[PDB]
Homo-oligomer: A and B are copies of this chain.
Amino acid sequence: ENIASEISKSVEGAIQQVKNLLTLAADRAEQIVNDLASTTTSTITRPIIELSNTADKIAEGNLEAEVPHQNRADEIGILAKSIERLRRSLKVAMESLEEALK
């Protein structure tokens, strides 16, 4: 009931309000990691694994498909274009080999 309690407790609500905002801010910051794992997966991981499997199929003797995503504007596109140079080099060599048979 006393003056000190009346005055001091009057700011308790406000402080909870401040804390509520801070908790929303903290939880939003906490979500960045899972979302970034997601982005990295779709943006980089998938394409890299795809390109790796493609390199492996080509090394194994499948030369029929142009390497996917050569059109991409970033370093994944650069990479994919380099693998296509490899595919074409292999394909010319195999074609010349086939011409030598018999």
Contacts and interface: CB of A to CB of B under 8 A. Distances in A.
- Interface majority SS (helix, strand, loop, mixed), chain A: helix
Q: Specify how many copies of this chain sit in the oligomer.
A: 4
A56 B84 CA distance: 9
Interface residues on A, range: 35 or more
B32 A55 contact: no
Interface string A17-43: 111011111101111111111111101
Contacts of A25: 18, 21-22, 25
Contact of A14 (B31, B82, B100): B31
Interface in A84-102: 85-90, 93-94, 96-97, 100-101
Given A48-B79, A96-B97, A17 B28 contact: yes
Interface of A: 1-12, 14-15, 17-19, 21-26, 28-41, 43-45, 48-49, 51-53, 55-56, 58-61, 72-79, 81-83, 85-90, 93-94, 96-97, 100-101
